[PDB]
Amino acid sequence: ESVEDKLELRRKQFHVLLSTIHELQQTL
Amino acid sequence: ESVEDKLELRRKQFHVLLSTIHELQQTL
Amino acid sequence: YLWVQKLGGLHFPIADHSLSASHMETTMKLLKTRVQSRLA
Amino acid sequence: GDLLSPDSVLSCLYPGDHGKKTPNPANQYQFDKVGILSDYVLELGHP
Amino acid sequence: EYLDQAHKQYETARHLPPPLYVLFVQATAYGQACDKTLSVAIEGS
Amino acid sequence: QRKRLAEKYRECLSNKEKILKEIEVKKEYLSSLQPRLNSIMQASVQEYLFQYETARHLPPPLYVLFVQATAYGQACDKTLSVAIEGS
Numbered sequence: 001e002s003v004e005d006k007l008e009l010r011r012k013q014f015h016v017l018l019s020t021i022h023e024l025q026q027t028l
Numbered sequence: 029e030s031v032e033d034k035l036e037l038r039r040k041q042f043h044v045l046l047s048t049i050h051e052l053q054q055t056l
Numbered sequence: 057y058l059w060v061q062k063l064g065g066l067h068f069p070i071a072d073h074s075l076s077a078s079h080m081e082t083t084m085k086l087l088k089t090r091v092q093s094r095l096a
Numbered sequence: 097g098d099l100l101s102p103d104s105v106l107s108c109l110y111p112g113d114h115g116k117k118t119p120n121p122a123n124q125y126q127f128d129k130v131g132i133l134s135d136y137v138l139e140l141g142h143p
Numbered sequence: 144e145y146l147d148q149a150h151k152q153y154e155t156a157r158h159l160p161p162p163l164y165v166l167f168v169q170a171t172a173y174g175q176a177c178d179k180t181l182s183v184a185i186e187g188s
Numbered sequence: 189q190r191k192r193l194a195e196k197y198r199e200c201l202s203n204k205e206k207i208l209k210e211i212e213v214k215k216e217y218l219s220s221l222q223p224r225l226n227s228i229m230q231a232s233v234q235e236y237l238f239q240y241e242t243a244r245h246l247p248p249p250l251y252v253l254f255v256q257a258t259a260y261g262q263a264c265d266k267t268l269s270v271a272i273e274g275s
Binding site: 018022 | 147150
Binding site: 017 | 214244255
């Protein structure tokens with residue numbers, strides 16, 4: 001459960017980074 | 029003055045992006 | 057064909073998603089049966 | 097009347113969008129799979 | 144992804160004809176809904 | 189009762205083998221994630237550009253919304269508050 005929570009946190013961080021890259025591509 | 033006024037908003041947006049990147053770097 | 061144009065949304069007596077909706081799943085099931093039947 | 101009623105304050109911020117229909121069509125296929133809506137919208141929230 | 148492309152496919156599918164765009168949207172929806180053994184793409188210039 | 193305990197012990201052995209398989213594969217996935225993070229760091233100007241424990245369990249669209257909401261609350265307008273409600 002701890003490993004799954006860490007993997008879900010890494011997946012949410014990667015999704016937040018992809019959303020920030022999409023927002024930077026939309027703003028520029 | 030115009031360059032500093034543009035660089036303020038540019039540094040704000042890039043600081044949000046770099047805060048996300050620094051959270052990802054501290055995560056991994 | 058007719059089923060291809062129903063997938064596109066063209067109604068022959070402007071494309072529609074609601075016309076494409078059920079026809080999508082039915083035609084994909086029919087394609088999945090057709091290829092397996094020809095290989096058999 | 098329906099000015100500050102929580103059902104339709106924010107219905108048309110952008111032009112249209114109707115507050116009712118689901119955005120992705122994969123939801124329409126998944127509804128058709130199990131045979132199943134504005135009551136659920138008023139129950140759970142507006143998409 | 145080794146350890147996105149949908150945005151590039153949407154920027155390509157902006158230029159599709161309307162029956163082809165409807166086919167693309169419904170095919171992606173049916174591929175993500177039930178059958179994951181399906182792949183779509185757009186070929187052209 | 190000895191039949192039930194023997195069958196339940198075999199089920200617990202299978203569940204322990206599954207937990208070990210999950211863990212092994214999970215560990216491998218974690219290692220891959222670490223490598224990806226390292227690659228991202230390498231890719232990572234940066235010098236000119238230069239709540240969490242509850243947000244550990246959010247869904248990914250909710251996590252993106254929480255990060256953007258805190259960024260907009262700290263960036264431009266301070267008249268905004270966010271909270272995470274649930275179990």
